[PDB]
Amino acid sequence: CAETEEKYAMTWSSDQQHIFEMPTGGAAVMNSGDNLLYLARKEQALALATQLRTQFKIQDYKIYRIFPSGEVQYLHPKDGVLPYQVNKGREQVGRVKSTIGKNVNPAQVKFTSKATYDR
Amino acid sequence: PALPFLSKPPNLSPDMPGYRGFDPLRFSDAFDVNWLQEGEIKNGRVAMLACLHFFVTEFYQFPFFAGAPKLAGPAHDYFVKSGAMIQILAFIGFLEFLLHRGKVLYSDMEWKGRKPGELGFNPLNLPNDKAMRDREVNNGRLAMLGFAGIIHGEFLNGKMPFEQITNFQP
Amino acid sequence: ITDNQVFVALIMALVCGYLAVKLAKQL
Amino acid sequence: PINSSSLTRAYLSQLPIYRRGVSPFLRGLEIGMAHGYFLIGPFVQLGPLRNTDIKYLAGLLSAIGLIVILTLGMLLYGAVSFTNDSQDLESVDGWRQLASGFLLGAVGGAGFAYLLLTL
Amino acid sequence: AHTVKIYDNCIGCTQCVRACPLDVLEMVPWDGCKAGQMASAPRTEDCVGCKRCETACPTDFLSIRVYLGGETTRSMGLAY
Amino acid sequence: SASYLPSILVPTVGLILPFASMAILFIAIEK
Amino acid sequence: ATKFPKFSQALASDPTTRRIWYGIATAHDFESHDGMTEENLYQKIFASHFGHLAIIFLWTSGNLFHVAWQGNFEQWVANPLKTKPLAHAIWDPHFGQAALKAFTRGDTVANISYSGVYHWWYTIGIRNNVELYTGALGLLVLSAVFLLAGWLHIQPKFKPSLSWFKNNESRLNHHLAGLFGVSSLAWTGHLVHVAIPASRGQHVGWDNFIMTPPHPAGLQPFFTGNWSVYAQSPDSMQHVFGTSQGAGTAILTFLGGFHPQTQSLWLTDMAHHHLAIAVIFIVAGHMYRTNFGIGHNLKTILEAHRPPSGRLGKGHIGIYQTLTNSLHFQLGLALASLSVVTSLVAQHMYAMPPYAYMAFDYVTQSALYTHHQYIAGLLIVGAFAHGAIFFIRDYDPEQNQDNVLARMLAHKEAVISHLSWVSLFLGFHTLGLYVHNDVVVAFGNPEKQILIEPIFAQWIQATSGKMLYGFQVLLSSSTSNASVAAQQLWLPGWLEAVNNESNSLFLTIGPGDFLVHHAIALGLHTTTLILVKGALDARGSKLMPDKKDFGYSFPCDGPGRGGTCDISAWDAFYLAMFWMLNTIGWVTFYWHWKHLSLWQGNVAQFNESSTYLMGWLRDYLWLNSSPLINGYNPYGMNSLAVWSWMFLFAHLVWATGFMFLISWRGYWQELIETLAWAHERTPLANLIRWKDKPVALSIVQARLVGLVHFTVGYILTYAAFVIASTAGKFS
Ligand code: CLA
Ligand code: CLA
Ligand code: CLA
Ligand SMILES: CC1=C(/C=C/C(C)=C/C=C/C(C)=C/C=C/C=C(C)/C=C/C=C(C)/C=C/C2=C(C)CCCC2(C)C)C(C)(C)CCC1
Ligand SMILES: CC1=C(/C=C/C(C)=C/C=C/C(C)=C/C=C/C=C(C)/C=C/C=C(C)/C=C/C2=C(C)CCCC2(C)C)C(C)(C)CCC1
Ligand code: SF4
Ligand code: SF4
Ligand code: SF4
Secondary structure (H helix, E strand, O other): OOOOOOOEEEEEEOOOOOOEOOOOEOOOOOOOOOOEEEEEHHHHHHHHHHHOOOOOOOHHHHHHEEEOOOOOOOOOOOOOOOOOOOOOOOOOOOOOOOOOOOOOOOHHHOOOOOOOOOO | OOOOOOOOOOOOOOOOOOOOOOOOOOOOOOOHHHHHHHHHHHHHHHHHHHHHOOOOOOOOOOOOOOOOOOOOOOOHHHHHHHHOHHHHHHHHHHHHOOOOOOOOOOOOOOOOOOOOOOOOOOOOOOOOOOOOOOOHHHHHHHHHHHHHHHHHHHHOOOOOOOOOOOOOOO | OHHHHHHHHHHHHHHHHHHHHHHHOOO | OOOHHHHHHHHHOOOOOOOOOHHHHHHHHHHHHHHHHHHOHHHHHOEEEOOOOOHHHHHHHHHHHHHHHHHHHHHHHHHHHHOOOOOOOOOHHHHHHHHHHHHHHHHHHHHHHHHOOOO | OEEEEEEEOOOOHHHHHHHHHOOOEEEEEEEOOOOEEEEEEOHHHHHHOOOOHHHHHOOOOOOOOEEEOOOHHHHOOOOO | OOOOHHHHHHOOOOOOHHHHHHHHHHHHHHO | OOOOOOOOOHHOOOEOOOHHHHHHHHHOOOOOOOOOOHHHHHHHHHHHHHHHHHHHHHHHHHHHHHHHOOOOOOHHOOOOOOOEOOOOOOOOOOOOOOOOHHHHHHOOOEEEEEHHHHHHHHHHHHOHHHHHHHHHHHHHHHHHHHHHHHOOOOHHHHHHOOOHHHHHHHHHHHHHHHHHHHHHHHHHHHHHHHHHHHOOOOOOOOOOOOOOOOOOOOOOOOOOHEEEEEEEEOOOOOEEEEEEOOOOOOOOOOOOOOOOOOOOOOOOHHHHHHHHHHHHHHHHOOOOOOOOOOOOOOOHOOOOOOOOOOOOOOOOOOOOOOOOOOOOOHHHHHHHOOOOHHHHHHHHHHOOOOOOOOOOOOOOOOHHHHHHHHHHHHHHHHHHHHHHHHHOOOOOOOOOOOOOOHHHHHHHHHHHHHHHHHHHHHHHHHHHHHHHHHHHOOOOOEEEOOOOOOOOHHHHHHHHOOOOOOOOOOOOOOHHHHHHOOOOOOHHHHHHHHHHHOOOOOOOOOHHHHHHHHHHHHHHHHHHHHHHHHHHHOOOOOOOOOOOOOOOOOOOOOOHHHHHOOOOOOOHHHHHHHHHHHHHHHHHHHHHHHHHHHOOHHHHHHHOOOOOOOHHHHEEEHHHHHHHHEEOOEEOOOHHHHHHHHHHHHHHHHHHHHHHHOOOOHHOOHHHHHHHHHHHHOOOOOOOOOOEEOOOOOOOOHHHHHHHHHHHHHHHHHHHHOOOOOOOOOO
């Protein structure tokens, strides 16, 4: 709940009072000017981002991750840029030198606290 | 301390009553030395009263119900049959609401008054919690073992409680 | 066929129970 | 929303927990005063000893047989959860007073129903 | 957390990022491919591990591999 | 043949040992 | 270490209920903990071995104590045909009144011990309850010894070094000599000193076993090699087991065959038997080098077996490295060899019944066989399961550079294609012939059946003297080389047991033997198709070659690339456990319906009504469950009312398995959210909030728990039907 779990607060703006669909279920009123939406988990929120963005222009939208100590975060957008569009600011993490074909066998990782792909 | 081959610094304490420095199997580890103390005191007092029943099995105080003097074996079964042995569990329950007041075995032991002794049952009150405690526990411990020595005298001898002592040997 | 040997039995497996908790609280 | 109205709020408000201030021993003694009086019922008429004159005594030993288990569950839940010491029912001490109140009040309810099955 | 690692088959066709419903994966300009793009997974603390990326990963065999690691609150995806 | 011993051991291991052992294992989750 | 999985911090951070289940099911997975290296692994499995052994000897002291204290053992010794062997007594407070009249056997209300234990303790020479008490204390002491060692070798300076554990070289010098050779020799020291005289009437307890020699002259004029004196006067014919009438005094006579009266093997034959096995194992203990240096280096024994034919890769060079460093290879060979040993035990406990007055109680013999067959299949499936664990978490194809193992992974495609071929062939040629025979029998015509005589088994029984077929070959022909070659030694005492149709040795054979034994080979080849599949495709398939990276029991790969339900090496376990229960199913249905035709007597009831499937579902399941399912009626009950209850109970286990096997997680993972919504929202219970978050069971656990209910439901149903069926037609 709001006493111990992270509530995700999707904030966005529109132009017309349309009708979208909640990830809770059922239609919502969709305040035209600017509106927030407290949600439970992130897949609901970005599923609402796909719910709106694949319909029509809904941009300048992002969830503030309400965590129960009080402060916020900035999910989705992160960098005023759409994530599959390429911005030259995102520093890559999570790559290796080659394919799976050069991953070590787990009998070399055995009795060590490594992973089968680290090289 | 006491047991000679250096095996004596367990979780116990030397100023505890009944102390003569003896835990070879280190039961004082892991078993809450104060609760083991209160179980030793309570086992000593109820074994003490129980062997006092095996001391006053003489003709005095047979008030109209039993008629079965000095049985010590199925006398337990004689009053399972006669009833009111459930009832003394009720009465002892009516004691042990008032005595310990927390009454759960290891969870929440009522350690408030420095000694495993509840409410200060002492209407005479000539001694307080002095080293008389030190001579209570032995008078429980001997009251434990020979108590077994009575009931095992009912087990395999099966003859009589008191009639081993004069010249009576198998 | 007797009773005392049953007491001796539960003594020996009570001690064996102390070795069971004794081995159990080290691995 | 619905089933949160002021009759629901007023009825749930004066329950033996949500009411303002009671000592947790008496706060549990009201709980056991309900439940221990209750649990004599489905052991007298339907228990295994419902045909001797132990229709009523088996209600006591069976029902208190449930009661010590239920207080054991009370002490488990206050042992694991409610780690703080805020002195109310969300504490350890207030919870074990709630459990001791449930035990003494529940056995009191059992003996009360047992003595009220005299008539 | 589910460790998502993105290997060097990643030709940067962005079906991973457009397929992921969590924005754990972005695109990074990487001058090793024809498109100059290669995906990254910085925010794997939000990674469910539903492997909807590995469905829509049109490489030879799976540039992006989702190893099922630890299970936190968010990675378990429970509502409450 | 101490015939009374199952009337002691079968309840005290059949029911009350998976009560206090539930307590020891389940509090032992949080110890 | 912080919470629960005091061993894995990857699960102690989990807030769900998965920390409990995976905290349990990965507890013994010692190769994947926080920081447990090799010395900290062998020094834990070595202690837990001792804890295990002490659990075994606590259990056998359990049987010794209940038979010692609640059983009717010496009253059973008085009349081993008549009185039923009693198990431990009952204490139900649930047996109201009418149940207790259905269990009283004397003063006791005990269960009937359908586990063959009084027979084996009666051939050991236990003729009292006192020896059972001294033995039960004698194993409480031994379990205290083993718990002392496991506690003692986890004490820190007595934790043995890993170079001692890698004395792989010399365990075989000590197991084959000490564990196998000496103890079996010591077991002859029982059989010569106890079982022979207490079978020949002489109560040689623990007193006179040094003053009464088992032969009247012994060992001062017997280092001279006059060993035919120990096989001088056998126990010929006119003897009842236990008394001294009609019995000789020789010790090691190898007559061969059975008793005439108790239909069990001679204890002279077992004394000579374990003596010869003892000598041959002690000879086999002198096999390998040690600190002395007279033996065989194992590197010189696997290195030398590279054929110059060149077909078998670069030989076994690489195998000795991957047995020392491995464990799941060594455990795979251990469960393989123990499992074939169990199936050998099962195939000989009925065939050559060792224990006096077995094959006279027809329930204990029917439970020992089925017991060791289901345990046999469990341990084979363990050998292949740890085979796949070896190929994932333990296999190095760079130390196994083009080794025999890497050759196996090379031609694993041909292996799985040909296992799938023979399994397909047998599955169209058992099911084809049973549906042929069942259609044809169904159409008013049992004659138009396909019955193939299994002539190869009939010819092999003709090689062992079964003259009831008319082949007249090596032992059935009484004039051949082997027939003259042991004419005095062990043949005429043994061909009487072969040509007899009372005993369960070399049974008479119809085409039910043909069609069933093809069904069994179907079960073996399907089950090895699965196990050898997900043991050789355990490491990488053309669906996903990442499989070695994910460990053994990873769940799936998601819907990607068509869908990937159960790709892991754990699936081969998960499916070949169904095929294990099935195959051991058909083994024990076949055995049990063969012997419900022998023991009833109507062998024609089998051979006319087992060549088709309604012969099984009619003549065996529908008819022999009749004294089962009458275990309690609306007219009363009897002693079978336990098993007829358990039977029904076990169906409720079995089908609950389907709830986990059929219906998978994401149903329940979005149903627990309704339950947690309803618990959070309600009054009077939102106080009582969980600590571990309620989460439906993960899809490795779920398939596992559905498998566990499938096994427990299966095995409890069939243990109900064996015992209630034979105990209903007899006793
Ligand atoms: C002579 C010396 C000797 C002896 C007797 C043993 C004995 C044993 N060692 Mg051992 N060991 C030795 C020297 C010895 N070791 C040396 C020198 C080393 C160092 C190089 C080791 C290193 C070592 C390790 C590292 C381990 C052992 C283990 C074991 C135990 C094996 C498990 C078991 O009980 O199986 C018993 C098996 C049988 C009795 C036979 C099973 C198979 C047969 C063919 C079937 C049974 C026969 C018959 C048909 C059935 C009878 C049943 C009856 C009902 C009819 C066993 C107690 C293991 C263990 O568990 O730790 C204790 C273990 O992990 N040992
Ligand atoms: C002596 C033999 C032996 C030994 C040492 C091992 C040892 C091991 N096995 Mg194993 N295994 C064996 C035999 C053996 N196996 C056999 C015979 C089989 C075939 C049945 C298997 C099948 C098997 C599988 C499939 C897996 C292992 C795994 C493992 C490893 C971890 C086990 C673990 O943490 O479990 C923890 C302990 C438990 C889960 C407790 C067992 C409870 C089971 C699941 C159900 C029993 C409940 C019971 C029936 C309910 C009672 C109710 C009543 C009505 C019947 C460990 C090295 C695992 C592994 O290495 O993967 C990482 C793994 O996935 N084994
Ligand atoms: C009645 C239950 C049943 C049956 C018949 C089978 C049959 C088979 N399983 Mg199997 N299996 C079952 C339950 C069953 N399984 C269960 C419960 C599990 C656990 C999930 C498994 C797990 C399992 C695994 C893991 C594997 C098999 C495999 C196989 C095949 C083994 C090779 C063989 O015998 O081919 C002979 C073929 C048959 C016996 C098929 C039956 C013949 C049919 C009925 C005739 C053809 C259709 C007929 C003309 C009717 C027309 C229909 C009409 C609509 C026109 C065989 C098809 C293996 C495989 O693929 O082997 C190659 C394999 O690896 N099974
Ligand atoms: C159906 C219905 C309902 C319900 C019901 C109810 C609610 C009931 C309950 C009831 C109950 C549930 C009751 C209770 C009772 C009780 C009381 C009223 C009190 C009494 C008292 C007591 C119990 C006491 C005790 C004791 C003793 C005896 C001794 C000492 C201790 C003590 C003090 C504790 C309603 C109404 C809602 C509605 C309508 C319908
Ligand atoms: C996966 C894996 C594995 C597996 C496991 C197992 C399970 C195996 C199998 C195996 C088995 C399970 C075994 C079997 C064997 C076979 C045999 C062994 C057969 C043969 C037969 C014979 C040999 C017989 C014959 C005869 C007769 C009849 C009489 C006369 C003489 C003679 C003896 C010749 C291993 C560990 C290896 C490796 C790793 C991986
Ligand atoms: S990896 Fe496959 S999915 Fe991810 S970007 Fe390159 S192509 Fe698009
Ligand atoms: S892991 Fe599951 S969530 Fe994270 S990217 Fe791949 S698919 Fe989207
Ligand atoms: S069902 Fe769940 S598990 Fe089975 S394949 Fe599709 S995703 Fe992987």
